[PDB]
Chains A and B, each alone.
Chain A
Amino acid sequence: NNLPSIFVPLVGLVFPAIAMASLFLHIQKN
């Protein structure tokens, strides 16, 4: 089963990193 061991790192780290990068790029974009 071991679904948490796969899903927790994704929501915790990878998705916030992608969101922060995209949001910063969209904020600074002219």
Chain B
Amino acid sequence: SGANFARAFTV
């Protein structure tokens, strides 16, 4: 679930 949230904050 962490990766899905991190997908928005990649930049």
Whether A and B touch (Cβ < 8 Å) is answered with no
Interface residues of A (CB under 8 A from B): none
Interface residues of B (CB under 8 A from A): none
